[PDB]
Design a protein around this ligand. Structure first.
Ligand code: CI9
Ligand code: CI9
Ligand SMILES: *[C@@H]1O[C@H](CO)[C@@H](O[C@@H]2O[C@H](CO)[C@@H](O[C@@H]3O[C@H](CO)[C@@H](O)[C@H](O[C@H]4O[C@H](CO)[C@@H](O)[C@H](O)[C@@H]4O)[C@@H]3O)[C@H](O)[C@H]2NC(C)=O)[C@H](O)[C@H]1NC(C)=O
Ligand SMILES: *[C@@H]1O[C@H](CO)[C@@H](O[C@@H]2O[C@H](CO)[C@@H](O[C@@H]3O[C@H](CO)[C@@H](O)[C@H](O[C@H]4O[C@H](CO)[C@@H](O)[C@H](O)[C@@H]4O)[C@@H]3O)[C@H](O)[C@H]2NC(C)=O)[C@H](O)[C@H]1NC(C)=O
Ligand SMILES: *[C@@H]1O[C@H](CO)[C@@H](O[C@@H]2O[C@H](CO)[C@@H](O)[C@H](O)[C@H]2NC(C)=O)[C@H](O)[C@H]1NC(C)=O
Ligand SMILES: *[C@@H]1O[C@H](CO)[C@@H](O[C@@H]2O[C@H](CO)[C@@H](O)[C@H](O)[C@H]2NC(C)=O)[C@H](O)[C@H]1NC(C)=O
Ligand SMILES: *[C@@H]1O[C@H](CO)[C@@H](O[C@@H]2O[C@H](CO)[C@@H](O)[C@H](O)[C@H]2NC(C)=O)[C@H](O)[C@H]1NC(C)=O
Ligand SMILES: *[C@@H]1O[C@H](CO)[C@@H](O[C@@H]2O[C@H](CO)[C@@H](O)[C@H](O)[C@H]2NC(C)=O)[C@H](O)[C@H]1NC(C)=O
Ligand SMILES: *[C@@H]1O[C@H](CO)[C@@H](O[C@@H]2O[C@H](CO)[C@@H](O)[C@H](O)[C@H]2NC(C)=O)[C@H](O)[C@H]1NC(C)=O
Ligand SMILES: *[C@@H]1O[C@H](CO)[C@@H](O[C@@H]2O[C@H](CO)[C@@H](O)[C@H](O)[C@H]2NC(C)=O)[C@H](O)[C@H]1NC(C)=O
Ligand code: NAG
Ligand code: NAG
Ligand code: NAG
Ligand code: NAG
Ligand code: NAG
Ligand code: NAG
Ligand code: CA
Ligand code: CA
Ligand code: CL
Ligand code: CL
Ligand code: ZN
Ligand code: ZN
Ligand code: ZN
Ligand code: ZN
Lengths: 694, 694
């Protein structure tokens, strides 16, 4: 029998281990020859594995690299202009890799060049509220200062945007042990903590969904017209560079000026965490100088696109995609995900060789240049947008399979909640103590839903990964899943070795998943979701779950507004239309569900499958959200303060945010009312797609 | 047998005559009680006729009306400020209608209020080239002048935009006998010519597809947020008013200043057609004063929406729509079209009562407020955009059925050319001399294609009617057809009595179509197209016809560019990508056509029907054209100089237009290159929707 069980049973932990080792022996930085060779290898293997076609789709996009002969670094300089302390030029390589070449040194991708000198201001995590506190409460002015911010809490691109708008002339990012060193665990290579010489790479763009900075809206193909750099999307205006905590301690230890305003501003280093500006009396004439010489360069990237044609509905696409480019070895990010995709392709291809085909077409993607801003997935989706918006059933992401070893983490559209619950009840838990129990049972026990007893937590999608174009631009139902840490007992951000040279095969094999059982569990969840989405007769989406969350989000945004009762009275601000729309959606979804269950007629089926497929699509507004034309989904967008986090009813949320500070309240509350109208209209319009069609 | 022939045979000229008489006894101005009563009558009759549901869809949109107690008029005033001549306050009503109430007097809808006084400048047709000639060649400055323009050649909204940008402080529009009085025919009531007291009503907005000025992008429903007037879309900034040629002669006869530059500036009145500014010496101190007191007011409008549910594909919609609101009696515009739609509904309902249903759903619409800017169709399409873009097969317009009695006029997407040729070969010609011959034969003989021997002319769609939202915003295959005049022997614009009180039932019955045979022919063409679109197993679109026109349009835009060979060399301006895309489209469409002909499998069929349906959709760019976000079709938009005319490759056309006058040629040619990239990309992306799907 060729059924889900056959597919799942063919997956092997040992295969995932072999692929992970194979993908992580050398760096695979986007735009480099090593990453093109790996693309060709994956293309060849996916053909071997049995896919019907496997092609490379290439684009020429703006990338950023340090200058090999003019290294980036930061100094403390004295009155004479002698550089008395310099930050590191590279992370000490891990054991046995000290001779590997082409390790890109730590840098912030897309930083402009410059050598700004000035007094430091420490800005905590560089969040919107951190700058509010500095400017509004502490009266500290960052204009013309170099700011130093600790990584964590929010996407680093938001930090840089926030510093620029505060008037900073440069930004230094660093990893504080408070956020990247778990108490009681040893630093790499002896444990999974960040050593003081470790540094987190990463881009600092604010693309808001645009893709390649030079070609927003259109693929960066052979004849593309490119914007000039000055008109490019999302580039920072001030130099930026990341450092480790040994180096940070040397920059922070001399800080003077104001004390930190409270303990939430203090990390774990043995320094006062003074905000500045500048250094204490003895060192008041010393300054900090950045030296940044990186260059932005249009560079070719390569996606691998594999097709397994559907037997019945070949014009319906279920997509499993994750990236292949890495900052260095990509032990976790992305190769722990790419190895899982590879084994999934292998298992599907085994069934195919025995004569099976899925009902719908499955597309498999190995994206490039994710690290540089989601570029490979976005340019491909721009090229193929018409095919995707009329044929795209669902997109399942496949980046890092693990960021811990405690329990499952799923973020997805409400339309997949029931599919996920059902699938995980059929899978075995890999957890110690849960031998013989379902993954649903272990997951629900370890990560209970905040709203519902006996169900597990499933979060909204945020951003900062390759599903962004599919979900928030195009409105294709999307999801992602991985193994994660215990959020209760672990106060650090992501995993400590994120985007460092220390993220290696050995990190994973020794410290995260020696048996590869959590990888195998994640392969079962991602692959099982793809299987159901591609094979189920009726698409496995439950519109009623969207109705439940829409009411939760309406209650939430109403509660935010109701902090301003006087203004709601003055400007006649009502949420009645939004609640009405949500009530209507709830009623219409309930009736649709009855018909779906109650309806031999393949036209009524496909009619109904199209209503299911186009339901996520219906939340798209072709005009986009304010000043963010590529965030078109009206229910979900990446937070304007932190690209990693999702925000619900984002247009209304941003219209309300900090509204008590706006100079013209009539205008500001008018725009809140406009966003309520847009949201109520879109919810009602999405509900009406589920009504009888005629 | 229930087939096309049964449907066509049920249509009766005498029924169309009865409905036309019924619809034209009183005025049906948008937003008035009389038009709401007619809406309710049509709703009731369409139910009687057998449709499955018939509902009113209402909206509250910005309309414009004169002030009943403060009439609009124009004066010549002397030095003392005595008004020595006043234009008329109303058109003399036609015989037997001199007691009809609620005839709206002539006005320009959406004019602001004002009483500007000044010297006249005569600006011919107020076209872009007319202003070029005045400013650039004749050195005449319109700043602070009142301009007088003759109607004709281009949409009146473009005239007003052109005058505003020239700095005019008011615009007077008038009907010249050169453009509205056919030699050798008598004035109404004794013939079909415009009398000297006749005046053409009409709106002067520049909405560029927006719909209601206050709610661009969203339906003007019960909770809509409205822009303030100052931010409304498309309103004119200077007062405007229309007059007849008796009154125009009194304003023009005294004109001095420069002579007309050549004969193309001279109409047929016994005046010199001097350009001005101002009057000749004796009258140099006299001035012209407008008095405009109209008000814009949010007003409820009502569309009637009838549904005939499909038997097999109920979630596929074929729409027959035309408007119901009229300026006065609407003898031709729109009731000659509305009577045809009414008889079509009646005939389809006869078949339905005998147990027939079409394969696909047919929607019938009686739109409101077309005269005020396409408002009813646009607001409904905004409300239902998600349903229309995933389910809309085709839209057939149904405004005026006749504008002459000579031959057929069809404007449509290339996807309908073959359907139209085929249908007209099966219909009888109503023309004298062609008894017993096909409509195809009479039409082809009278209106030969400029490109192909033995085929008839079919034009691109322009705008200024209710298909605009469906075709240029949403990308639904659209068409229109009517009987027209002999363009060779007739130099006048449209028909002479257009938008005057003289457009009555008697005009049609006495002078255009006493037997109602041309109406019946038009009912057969419009109804037959709907029938085929809704019943054919394979949608009746031929993608190959799009390939042929795309090459024609590419040749045309390349030829425009090649007038500037030096600049194409300097800035490396190549059309190679656009020709490549067109070649690819031609090849892929040919292969698709083979499969379509070569393919018992309803999924392959529907897959293929969806590829046919989504092909027009693929030409939409979600980012819109520059500064015109609601014109999204990349192949066709209304001309930026004349909303009635269509332009092909409009983004490239407007980038090239008058480019030799741009101050920064590097920038200007850069934007030409950008538009070539967008067009080549969109043509290739549309071609790829016809490739095998996996
Ligand atoms: O250019 C781009 O867009 C991205 C390129 C690249 N992409 C990337 O590296 N992506 C990695 C990013 C890892 C980021 C790690 N990180 C996050 C942060 C800051 O967090 C930001 C806010 O996160 C949004 C989630 O908000 C809470 C939702 O919770 C989801 C998990 N659920 C959960 C919640 C509560 C609890 N508790 O406390 O019981 C438990 C859970 N569990 O899951 O168990 N700092 N570092 C990835 O794997 O997607 C990059 O970011 O540089
Ligand atoms: O707000 C709005 O957008 C519109 C509201 C309202 N809408 C409306 O009244 N619509 C009427 C409009 C009638 C307009 C009459 N008109 C046109 C003009 C100016 O012409 C503008 C350019 O017309 C575009 C067509 O360009 C040529 C395409 O040819 C189509 C006919 N084909 C043709 C061509 C050549 C020949 N020859 O010479 O052999 C023959 C033909 N035939 O058809 O035989 N002035 N008045 C309608 O029925 O659609 C309005 O305009 O006020
Ligand atoms: C949720 O679904 C319900 C349908 O069950 C839908 O209800 C609709 O509500 C609108 C109001 O937003 C109703 O609109 C009314 O329509 C009648 C004609 O049918 C008009 O006469 C009413 O207008 C008068 O009253 C207004 C309010 O006092 C005045 O402002 C106005 O000047 C008029 O005097 C009004 O337009 C509509 O009838 C129902 N439709 C039904 C019941 O089928 C509701 O809108 C949906 N929610 C959302 C957010 O879409
Ligand atoms: C019409 O359809 C045809 C397919 O039949 C399609 O042809 C494609 O053309 C592009 C060029 O625009 C080809 O792109 C090449 O791809 C190869 C790899 O396959 C690259 O190595 C090439 O790049 C090199 O050469 C360039 C030009 O000199 C350099 O600029 C560059 O630096 C590299 O040195 C190049 O990218 C593509 O291979 C074909 N695809 C085929 C034949 O299948 C054509 O693009 C379609 N037209 C449109 C407008 O889409
Ligand atoms: C990763 O695995 C691939 C596939 O086995 C290896 O590539 C093969 O290498 C052998 C020996 O050089 C060649 O004969 C094959 O042609 C290669 N196959 C391909 C590229 O599809 C590759 O060597 C492995 N890489 C590492 C680092 O172990
Ligand atoms: C930090 O690095 C800088 C740059 O290499 C060092 O300064 C240079 O020192 C050399 C040798 O003394 C001089 O010839 C260069 O002119 C200096 N360049 C600059 C820009 O100052 C500096 O010595 C290093 N500081 C420490 C503490 O190692
Ligand atoms: C998840 O599984 C549940 C339980 O099997 C499914 O719900 C059942 O669906 C069947 C088939 O339509 C119904 O007859 C039952 O009444 C449903 N039981 C319920 C709601 O308790 C559910 O559809 C599955 N969800 C998917 C596949 O997305
Ligand atoms: C247009 O035709 C309609 C339909 O026949 C007429 O409306 C009917 O009028 C009679 C007599 O008043 C009523 O008893 C019916 O109830 C009406 N039916 C409707 C509105 O559906 C209307 O009188 C005619 N108008 C003109 C000007 O002739
Ligand atoms: C044109 O119309 C205007 C406005 O009605 C006439 O001017 C008015 O004449 C009356 C009676 O003589 C005066 O009391 C008003 O004060 C005048 N109003 C204005 C604005 O001038 C004018 O007589 C008419 N001209 C002609 C030739 O008929
Ligand atoms: C218009 O009619 C022509 C002639 O009947 C149709 O073209 C034929 O279509 C049949 C059925 O597929 C083919 O087998 C013939 O070879 C075609 N003849 C040709 C192209 O000369 C054409 O499809 C009709 N167009 C429509 C219905 O849109
Ligand atoms: C890198 O720095 C070197 C050495 O100073 C310089 O010659 C070269 O131009 C730089 N390279 C780039 C790509 O800017
Ligand atoms: C911050 O500093 C600069 C002066 O260098 C000034 O232009 C800016 O307005 C200041 N803002 C304050 C004090 O809020
Ligand atoms: C693996 O699980 C154990 C047991 O909870 C834990 O102590 C260890 O820290 C985990 N490893 C990682 C990398 O989280
Ligand atoms: C119309 O004009 C009258 C009479 O001068 C005036 O009283 C009234 O306000 C005007 N009506 C509107 C709607 O402006
Ligand atoms: C037209 O007239 C006004 C002066 O009233 C002036 O502002 C404008 O620049 C003039 N333009 C010319 C002469 O081109
Ligand atoms: C009807 O046709 C005749 C014959 O060509 C023509 O003389 C007459 O002008 C036509 N009527 C109209 C309104 O065009
Ligand atoms: Ca792009
Ligand atoms: Ca609107
Ligand atoms: Cl992921
Ligand atoms: Cl029409
Ligand atoms: Zn990643
Ligand atoms: Zn990453
Ligand atoms: Zn009309
Ligand atoms: Zn009209």
């Amino acid at each position: 029998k060729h059924n889900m069980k056959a597919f799942l049973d063919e997956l092997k932990a040992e295969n995932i281990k072999k692929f992970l080792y194979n993908f992580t022996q050398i760096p695979h930085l986007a735009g480099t020859e090593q990453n093109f060779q790996l693309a060709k290898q994956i293309q060849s293997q996916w053909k071997e594995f049995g896919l019907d076609s496997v092609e490379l789709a290439h684009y020429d996009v703006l990338l950023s690299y340090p200058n090999k002969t003019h290294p980036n670094y930061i100094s403390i300089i004295n009155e004479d202009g002698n550089e008395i302390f310099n930050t590191s030029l590279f992370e000490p390589p891990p054991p046995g890799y000290e001779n590997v070449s082409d390790i890109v040194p730590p840098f912030s991708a897309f930083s402009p060049q410059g050598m700004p000198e000035g007094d430091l201001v420490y800005v905590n995590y560089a969040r919107t509220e951190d700058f509010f506190k500095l400017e509004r409460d502490m009266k500290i002015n960052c204009s013309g200062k170099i700011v130093i911010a600790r990584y964590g809490k929010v996407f680093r691109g938001n930090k840089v945007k926030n510093a620029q708008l505060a008037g900073a002339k440069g930004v230094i990012l660093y990893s504080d042990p408070a956020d990247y060193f778990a108490p009681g665990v040893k630093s790499y290579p002896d444990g999974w903590n960040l050593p003081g010489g470790g540094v987190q790479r990463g881009n600092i763009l604010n693309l808001n969904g645009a893709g390649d900075p030079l070609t927003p809206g259109y693929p960066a193909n052979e004849y593309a017209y490119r914007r000039g750099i000055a008109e490019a999307v999302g580039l920072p205006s001030i130099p930026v560079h990341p450092i480790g905590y040994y180096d940070a301690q040397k920059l922070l230890e001399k800080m003077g000026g104001s004390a930190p305003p409270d303990s939430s501003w203090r990390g774990s280093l043995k320094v006062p965490y003074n905000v500045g500006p500048g250094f204490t009396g003895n060192f008041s004439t010393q300054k900090v100088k950045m030296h940044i010489h990186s260059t932005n360069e249009v560079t070719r990237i390569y996606n691998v696109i594999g097709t397994l044609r559907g037997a019945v509905e070949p014009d319906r696409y279920v997509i499993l995609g994750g990236h292949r480019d890495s900052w260095v070895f990509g032990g976790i990010d992305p190769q722990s995900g790419a190895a899982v995709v590879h084994e999934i392709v292998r298992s599907f291809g085994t069934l195919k060789k025995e004569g099976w085909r899925p009902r719908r077409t499955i597309l498999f993607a190995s994206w490039d240049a994710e690290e540089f801003g989601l570029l490979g997935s976005t340019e491909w989706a721009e090229e193929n947008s018409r095919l995707l918006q009329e044929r795209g059933v669902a997109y399942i992401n496949a980046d890092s399979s693990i960021e811990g070893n405690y329990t499952l983490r799923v973020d997805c559209t409400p339309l997949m909640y029931s599919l996920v619950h059902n699938l995980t009840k059929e899978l075995k838990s890999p957890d110690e103590g849960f031998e013989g129990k379902s993954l649903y049972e272990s997951w629900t026990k370890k990560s209970p839903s905040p709203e519902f007893s006996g169900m597990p937590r499933i979060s909204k999608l945020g951003s900062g990964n390759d599903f962004e174009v599919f979900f928030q631009r195009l409105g294709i139902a999307s999801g992602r899943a991985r193994y994660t840490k215990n959020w209760e007992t672990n106060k650090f951000s992501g995993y400590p070795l994120y985007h460092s040279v220390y993220e290696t095969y050995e990190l994973v094999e020794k410290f995260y998943d020696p048996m590869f059982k959590y990888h195998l569990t994640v392969a079962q969840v991602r692959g099982g979701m793809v299987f159901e989405l591609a094979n189920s007769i009726v698409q496995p989406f439950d519109c009623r779950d969207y109705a439940v969350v829409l009411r939760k989000y309406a209650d939430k945004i109403y509660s935010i507004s109701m902090k301003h009762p006087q203004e709601m009275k003055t400007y006649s601000v009502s949420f009645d239309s939004l609640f009405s729309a949500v009530k209507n959606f709830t009623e219409i979804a309930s009736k649709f569900s009855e018909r779906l269950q109650d309806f031999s007629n393949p036209i009524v089926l496909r009619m109904m499958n199209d209503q299911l497929m186009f339901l996520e699509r219906a939340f798209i507004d072709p005009l986009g959200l304010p000043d963010r034309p590529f965030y078109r989904h009206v229910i979900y967008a990446p937070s304007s303060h932190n690209k990693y986090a999702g925000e619900s009813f984002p247009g209304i949320y941003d219209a309300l945010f900090d509204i008590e500070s706006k100079v013209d309240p009539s205008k500001a509350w008018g725009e809140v009312k406009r966003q309520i109208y847009v949201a109520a209209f879109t919810v009602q319009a999405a509900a009406e797609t589920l009504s009888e069609v005629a």
